[PDB]
Design a protein around this ligand. Structure first.
Ligand SMILES: [Ca+2]
Ligand SMILES: [Ca+2]
Ligand SMILES: [Ca+2]
Ligand SMILES: [Ca+2]
Ligand SMILES: [Ca+2]
Ligand SMILES: [Ca+2]
Ligand SMILES: [Ca+2]
Ligand SMILES: [Ca+2]
Ligand SMILES: [Ca+2]
Ligand SMILES: [Ca+2]
Ligand SMILES: [Ca+2]
Ligand SMILES: [Ca+2]
Lengths: 154, 154, 154, 154, 154, 154, 154, 154
């Protein structure tokens, strides 16, 4: 069941011997993980919430790595649930998305980065990546991002 | 293709907007990864190489986590390729495996831990888990282990 | 026919009410357009016609955007229809294409940029991209390029 | 795959030559784009929000064109999500739509312009097109409009 | 058989006339070739063998080009056949692979660069790309790399 | 997809490890390439344009090799597009081809060398291979040749 | 029937007009012909009849060409019909064939030259190609040869 | 493959013996060849270009025979590619063909001689066969003729 070659498999508190392959497995020292994350977005009175590389990086250090490398496949910004507008933006290209929402279906603006737009951000990389703009005197928006992070240290 | 709901997908250096779900995704703060690892096994003149929890832990810190939790699903010990014997052992139960090998098919002894034998080892856990015994005046053996590690810090 | 949910559709000078979706549509603030363009190529006595980023950009400002971003998917250079040669070149890689033509089938040299060769050129980007070389004392060649342009200003 | 006639297609950072058509492509100097837009609607104490041609035009200049031409295929007005009423109107014909809504399904009034009702608005055109009427002392409504805009300058 | 349009094809020491196409073929001045290469790796007492861009370039000049451009699709490092370990690494990302091997199946660590990880290296590019780490006092490892090289000079 | 044996393939800027074959690949140090070329043919007032081995060789050095070996599989000579005649000839055998053409279908004379007529020309080889004869006071003809070139230096 | 495009074909002493192709046919100035020949073989008292290149050439001048090029695909030597032996030989390789025959089935020795053994003999080529050996005081043998001859003069 | 009766056929530089037929092949001393030819047509200010038997004969001596016999199966006259007229004529019968052409499809007038109109022309035959008439002050026309020539000398 789990590669039991010698004796029958049976879930029990007692292990099971097996014959592993003739050759040790090829090992990946710094593996990768694709997973959604949540970003804090401390309140801003300007109404403009800037997503830097430091932001994603510091939020990715809370998933385990200390000095992470990452890429971004998607970014969704959700406003507060009320009658609010959120404007998501890619700082380099200029792609701009808008959505207005109600209390049930809150505002949702997403940008999607194809493999040719995906950019690798190291520990020395900085700069602004995405920018969120809500009307001033509004709650803080909700940001979700699909990243592929991995350890840098070899 | 990648969840493009608004415009057609096309791999290019320019991102693609999309409509994310009505609800943010459920996020796992400390994810898990099942992967084989390799353990150093500094030379021992007794011929006996003890695998403690500190060993697996220190080798799992090199995969990214600083204070990891882990379990073990398998352990394979491979001797040097020559005419040598390796004896693998589970210290608690007493399961003992032996193999002798030639230069092509090197010695290979594996123990397999079913879900009821899998034990969760935290950062405060210690003790001896596995013990490898080779004849004295022999090369250091090769240890492969399938672990499921994850961050502990919340 | 056009999303008429309330009353029947009928083309007439009188509009038709409808029920739009529960949620406003996700809006793309700076949309993209993939389209062929034509570049002027002022006469050169050297016989060498250099295509800079400023060239494509100034020719893309005539499609509407003032400060455009763009990528290039293809470049075809066509010589004059007579007995002439055109040499197209990518300045960075070094890819070089040649064609000789007659009065019916004029010379045609094309370079094709796959998604990994497509490069994003902003408003601060400059440099030479493509180079066309015709024999001196020849008519000006004809350049066609498939670009994906979009507004930069957010 | 992308019109590769000479060599096989392979996504890589290196372009691909190809044979373009015998004749250059027919070029459209001022292309068109059909897309939804969002209109600001500065607060009004009368409760009546007038949509002029200048409104749509100024909101369409933010999509890239400086002096745009446009037509309108649809107009949806959404009120605030609470217990509110929105009245949408075509100023010329007199078509009037009403909807009352709750916090989940917010008020939604749409007018739909068939090809015989679609009117071309230039840069010299003015006048009132649509009129929205909400009860005084109410939030500003949300307007979505499907336009087909294009550059005017030749 | 080989495009014989005038007379029948027959392999003989006498050529065969034919009617070539109406238009000369489109010519690629600097063609590309994807092929595996072998890198020398002069002995190092540190046990660490650094693969720079100069390394691949100098090994690619022996395939014919003088000033080559190239990309890398794969890198496999093979240790000596004995009881040895090889650690392959991508210097930028941090991907790390390990393998231990016997006399028959020698150690083999490979990294694979997808089209979005493939990077174009010119004649002015430098820096470290891959790093191999073997225990000190060990034989030199064996490096195989799939490159797509092409001439730069136009 | 590209030989990914360890993890799933996904085009991204992050490489993919893999298990290469048990044995390094057999490497070809001086590879071959079959491709059409174009030859300059400086104007001649005699009306006779002689194609030596030096001609093909110097035109093949512009494809990358410095000291190339080559064979010839085909030779097509195209005259100017007007009302002209071209006479192609193999200097050794005596095969002679003629064509007259109009402005649309320009003159085209081709000779085709089967594998028994294909001759290997080294860097010490010289002599006349093909001879083109156009009426004096005529434009220079266009020569296309399918060669299989390869590096000589070992 | 014979390419009659204008009027119906009818064999009669009156020609038939037709529309020839848009382009004149590609012309072969020195055509080739594969045909068997017969060689005189003036009597020799040694019993040995040497076939030089001059022999085949002089016998091929009687088929029309003055300065011919040729290759050889086969050589059959037939002895006199009585009780005689013929020995055919290739002078370069050393291939030797023997046959003895009766009055009905006369001696027949053939050598067959595959496309890699076929050699092109020009007007400057000389040397011995084939050698026939009959017992002294015997009639002259009969030689048949399949040649591919063509004019050399361009 | 090529009549190999003794040993297997294999293309190699080494010949192959075979058993030829019991009887030598029947030999044709002066073979025939049907092939198109091109005729020079020195410029004429009258605008009338007369095709004698000497013309075809002298143009057929350049295909190899010195004193040839021939017949004619077809004659196509092509004018210059511009706006010109060509009139082809059979001098004996009186058949007259006309065509006017443009720059793409040049003028083309053909006469076709069925087997009863085909006439055998020896080395003593003379006279006018075909006559071409173009307007004076025009380029020289292009004549193609399908002949069946053969050696006369026995
Ligand atoms: Ca690491
Ligand atoms: Ca269990
Ligand atoms: Ca954690
Ligand atoms: Ca890509
Ligand atoms: Ca914009
Ligand atoms: Ca315009
Ligand atoms: Ca080059
Ligand atoms: Ca051959
Ligand atoms: Ca070489
Ligand atoms: Ca000749
Ligand atoms: Ca007849
Ligand atoms: Ca004869």
């Amino acid at each position: 069941t789990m590669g039991s070659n010698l004796i029958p498999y049976a879930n029990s508190p007692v292990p099971i011997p097996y014959t592993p392959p003739v050759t040790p497995v090829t090992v990946i020292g710094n593996p990768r993980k694709t997973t959604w994350i949540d970003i804090d977005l401390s309140s801003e009175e300007s109404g403009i919430y800037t997503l830097t590389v430091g932001s994603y990086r510091n939020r990715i250090t809370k998933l385990g790595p200390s000095k992470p490398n990452f890429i971004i496949e998607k970014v969704a910004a959700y406003a507060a649930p009320g009658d609010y507008k959120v404007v998501l933006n890619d700082f380099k290209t200029g792609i701009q998305v808008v959505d207005e929402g109600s209390y049930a279906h809150r505002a949702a603006a997403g940008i999607l980065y194809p493999p040719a737009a995906q950019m690798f951000y190291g520990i020395s990389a900085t700069g602004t990546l995405n920018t969120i703009t809500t009307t001033a005197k509004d709650p803080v928006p909700v940001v979700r991002a699909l990243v592929t992070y991995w350890d840098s240290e070899q």
